[PDB]
Short mmCIF file of C-alpha atoms in Angstrom, two decimals:
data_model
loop_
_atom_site.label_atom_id
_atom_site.label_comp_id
_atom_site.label_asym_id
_atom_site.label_seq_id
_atom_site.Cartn_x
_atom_site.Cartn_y
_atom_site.Cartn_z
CA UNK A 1 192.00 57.14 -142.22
CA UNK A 2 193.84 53.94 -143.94
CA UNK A 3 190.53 53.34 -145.89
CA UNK A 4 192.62 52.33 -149.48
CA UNK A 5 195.04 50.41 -147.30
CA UNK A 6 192.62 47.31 -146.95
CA UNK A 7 190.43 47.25 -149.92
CA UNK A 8 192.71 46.73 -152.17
CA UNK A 9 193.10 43.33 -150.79
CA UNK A 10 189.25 43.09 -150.91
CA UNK A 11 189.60 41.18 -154.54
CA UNK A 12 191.83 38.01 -153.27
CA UNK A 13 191.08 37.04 -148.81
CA UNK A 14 187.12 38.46 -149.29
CA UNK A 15 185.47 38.29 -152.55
CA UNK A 16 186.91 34.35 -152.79
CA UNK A 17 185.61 31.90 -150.27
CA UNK A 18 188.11 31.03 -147.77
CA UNK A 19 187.25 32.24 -144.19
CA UNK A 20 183.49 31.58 -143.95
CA UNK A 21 184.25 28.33 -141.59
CA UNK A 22 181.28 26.55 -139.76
CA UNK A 23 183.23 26.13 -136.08
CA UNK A 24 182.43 22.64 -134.83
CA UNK A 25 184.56 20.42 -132.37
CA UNK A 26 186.14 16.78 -133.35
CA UNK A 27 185.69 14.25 -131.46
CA UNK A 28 187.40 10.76 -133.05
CA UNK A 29 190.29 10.56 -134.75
CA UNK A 30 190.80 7.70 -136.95
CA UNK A 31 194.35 7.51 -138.49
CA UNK A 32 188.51 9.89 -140.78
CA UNK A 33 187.78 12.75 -138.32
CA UNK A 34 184.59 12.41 -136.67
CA UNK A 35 183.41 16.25 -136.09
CA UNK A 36 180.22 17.36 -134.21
CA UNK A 37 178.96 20.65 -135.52
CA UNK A 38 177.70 23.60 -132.93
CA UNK A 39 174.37 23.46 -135.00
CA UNK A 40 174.29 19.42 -133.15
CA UNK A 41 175.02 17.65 -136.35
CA UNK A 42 177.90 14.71 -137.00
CA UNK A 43 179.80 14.27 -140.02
CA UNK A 44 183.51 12.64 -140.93
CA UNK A 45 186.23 14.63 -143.04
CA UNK A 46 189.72 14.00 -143.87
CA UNK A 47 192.54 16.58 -144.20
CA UNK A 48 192.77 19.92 -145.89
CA UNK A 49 195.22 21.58 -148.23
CA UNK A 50 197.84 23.13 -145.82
CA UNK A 51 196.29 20.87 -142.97
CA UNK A 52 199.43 18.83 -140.62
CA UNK A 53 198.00 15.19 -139.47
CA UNK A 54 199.24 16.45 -136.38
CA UNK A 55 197.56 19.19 -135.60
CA UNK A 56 194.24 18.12 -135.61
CA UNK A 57 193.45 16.71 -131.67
CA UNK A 58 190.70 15.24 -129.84
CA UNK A 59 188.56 17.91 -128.13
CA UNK A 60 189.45 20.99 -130.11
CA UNK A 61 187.53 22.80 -132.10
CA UNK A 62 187.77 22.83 -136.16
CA UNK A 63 186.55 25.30 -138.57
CA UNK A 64 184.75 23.41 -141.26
CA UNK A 65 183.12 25.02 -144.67
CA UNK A 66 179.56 25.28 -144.75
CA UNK A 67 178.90 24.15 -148.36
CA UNK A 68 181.18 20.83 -148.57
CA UNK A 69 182.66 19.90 -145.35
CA UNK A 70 186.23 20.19 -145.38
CA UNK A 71 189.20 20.90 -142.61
CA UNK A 72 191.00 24.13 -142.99
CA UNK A 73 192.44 25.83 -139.98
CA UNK A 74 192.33 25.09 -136.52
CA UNK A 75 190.54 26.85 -134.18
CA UNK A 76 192.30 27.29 -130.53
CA UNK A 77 190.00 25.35 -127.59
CA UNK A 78 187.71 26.44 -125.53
CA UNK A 79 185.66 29.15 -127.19
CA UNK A 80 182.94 29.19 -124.74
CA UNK A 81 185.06 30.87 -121.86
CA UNK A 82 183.53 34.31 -121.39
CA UNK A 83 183.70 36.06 -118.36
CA UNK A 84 187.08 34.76 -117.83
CA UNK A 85 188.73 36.27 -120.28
CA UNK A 86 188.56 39.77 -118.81
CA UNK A 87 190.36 38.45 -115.79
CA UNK A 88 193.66 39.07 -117.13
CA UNK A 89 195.09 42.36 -116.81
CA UNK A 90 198.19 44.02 -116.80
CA UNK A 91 200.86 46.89 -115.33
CA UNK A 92 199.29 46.79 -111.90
CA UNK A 93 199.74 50.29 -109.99
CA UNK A 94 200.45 49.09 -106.36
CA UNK A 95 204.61 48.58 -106.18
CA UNK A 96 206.92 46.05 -104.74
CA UNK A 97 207.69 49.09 -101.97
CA UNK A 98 204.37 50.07 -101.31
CA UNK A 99 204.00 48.04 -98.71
CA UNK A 100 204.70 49.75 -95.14
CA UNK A 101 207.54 48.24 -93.46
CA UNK A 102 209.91 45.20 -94.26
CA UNK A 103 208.70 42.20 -92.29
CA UNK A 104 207.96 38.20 -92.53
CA UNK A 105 205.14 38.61 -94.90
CA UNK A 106 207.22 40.21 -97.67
CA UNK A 107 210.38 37.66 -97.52
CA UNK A 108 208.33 34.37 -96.94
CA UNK A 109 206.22 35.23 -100.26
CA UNK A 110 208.92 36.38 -102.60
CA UNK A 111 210.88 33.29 -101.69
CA UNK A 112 208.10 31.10 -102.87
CA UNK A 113 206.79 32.90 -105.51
CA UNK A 114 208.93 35.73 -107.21
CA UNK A 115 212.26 33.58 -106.96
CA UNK A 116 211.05 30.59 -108.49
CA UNK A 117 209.88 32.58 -111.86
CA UNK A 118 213.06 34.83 -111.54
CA UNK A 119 215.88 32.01 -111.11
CA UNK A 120 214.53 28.83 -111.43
CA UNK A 121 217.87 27.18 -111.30
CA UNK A 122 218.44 28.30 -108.08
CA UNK B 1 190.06 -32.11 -174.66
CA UNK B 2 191.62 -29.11 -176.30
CA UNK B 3 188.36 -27.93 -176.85
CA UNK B 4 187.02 -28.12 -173.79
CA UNK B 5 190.13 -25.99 -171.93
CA UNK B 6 189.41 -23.56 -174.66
CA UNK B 7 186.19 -22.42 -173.77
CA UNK B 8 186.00 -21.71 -169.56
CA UNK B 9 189.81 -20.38 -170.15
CA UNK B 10 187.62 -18.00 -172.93
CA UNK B 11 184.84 -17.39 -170.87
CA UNK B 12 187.62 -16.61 -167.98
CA UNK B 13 188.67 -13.64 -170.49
CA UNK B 14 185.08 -12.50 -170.93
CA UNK B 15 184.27 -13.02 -167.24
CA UNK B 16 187.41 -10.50 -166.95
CA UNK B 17 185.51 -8.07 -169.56
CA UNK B 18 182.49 -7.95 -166.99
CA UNK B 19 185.45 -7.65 -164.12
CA UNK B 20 186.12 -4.45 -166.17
CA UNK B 21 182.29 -3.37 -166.17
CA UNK B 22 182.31 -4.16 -161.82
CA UNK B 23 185.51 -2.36 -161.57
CA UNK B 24 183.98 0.99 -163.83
CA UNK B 25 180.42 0.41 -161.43
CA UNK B 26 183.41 0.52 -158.32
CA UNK B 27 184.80 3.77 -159.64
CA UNK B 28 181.63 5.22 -159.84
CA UNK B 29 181.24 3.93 -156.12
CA UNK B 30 184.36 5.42 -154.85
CA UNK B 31 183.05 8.67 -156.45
CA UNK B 32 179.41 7.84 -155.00
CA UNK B 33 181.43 7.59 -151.40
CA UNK B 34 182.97 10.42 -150.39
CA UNK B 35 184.45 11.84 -147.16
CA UNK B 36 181.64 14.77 -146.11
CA UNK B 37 178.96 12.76 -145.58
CA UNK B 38 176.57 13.62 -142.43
CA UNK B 39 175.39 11.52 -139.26
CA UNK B 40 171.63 10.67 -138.80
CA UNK B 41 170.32 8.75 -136.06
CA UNK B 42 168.42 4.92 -137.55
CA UNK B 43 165.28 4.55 -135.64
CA UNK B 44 164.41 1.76 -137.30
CA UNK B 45 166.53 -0.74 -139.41
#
C-alpha cells in the first residue's frame, strides 16, 4: 500500500551513491587504517566525512566504497554468525507457576539467577 | 672579495628557484601519493 511513501525519497539516499559499501574488516590502526577486503585484497584509508577516530577498532568490520576506497560507516562485528542468530527468541509460554509443586529446585534457582537481574543491589 | 660573496650568495637565490621547481615536482608527489592505494604481494625485489 505505502508505494508513494518511499519513492519520493528515491531522488536523494538511491539515485546518489552513498550506500553501495564493499564490507571488509580492519586490521591495523595507525594513529592509516590497514583494511583487508572479503574479496582477500589489502589496502590503507584514512577517515571519512562524518567518521569519529574513535570508532573505528581493530577487528571490526568497515564498509568501504568500491570505486575509491574510503571509510564511511561502521559495520557491527561478526557478520558471519548464522545459525546463531535464530537462537534468540522471546515471550516463552511455560510460566513461573507452571511448575507442579513448590520445592528446592524452584528457590535455589531464582536465588541465583532471577534475583541477581531483579535487585542487583541486594 | 665583494665579488666573490656575490655570486654563490646569487646562485643560493637561484638554487632556491630550482627549490621552487623540487617543491612544485613534491606537490605533484603528494597528489601522486594518496591514501587508497592497494596491497600486492613482491615476489621478487
Amino acid at each position: 500500500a505505502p508505494s508513494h511513501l518511499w519513492d519520493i525519497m528515491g531522488d536523494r539516499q538511491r539515485l546518489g551513491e552513498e550506500h553501495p559499501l564493499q564490507v571488509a574488516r580492519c586490521t591495523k590502526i595507525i594513529k592509516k587504517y590497514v583494511i583487508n577486503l572479503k574479496q582477500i585484497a589489502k589496502f590503507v584509508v584514512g577517515l571519512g566525512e562524518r567518521v569519529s577516530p574513535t570508532d573505528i577498532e581493530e577487528g571490526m568490520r568497515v564498509g568501504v566504497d568500491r570505486s575509491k576506497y574510503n571509510i564511511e560507516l561502521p559495520l557491527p562485528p561478526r557478520i558471519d554468525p548464522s545459525v546463531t542468530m535464530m537462537t534468540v527468541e522471546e515471550k516463552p509460554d511455560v510460566t513461573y507457576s507452571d511448575v507442579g509443586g513448590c520445592k528446592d529446585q524452584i528457590e535455589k534457582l531464582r536465588e541465583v539467577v532471577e534475583l541477581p537481574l531483579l535487585s542487583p543491589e541486594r | 672579495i665583494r665579488i666573490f660573496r656575490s655570486e654563490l650568495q646569487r646562485l643560493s637565490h637561484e638554487n632556491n628557484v630550482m627549490l621552487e621547481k623540487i617543491k612544485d615536482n613534491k606537490e605533484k608527489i603528494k597528489n601522486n601519493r594518496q591514501l587508497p592505494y592497494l596491497v600486492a604481494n613482491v615476489v621478487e625485489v
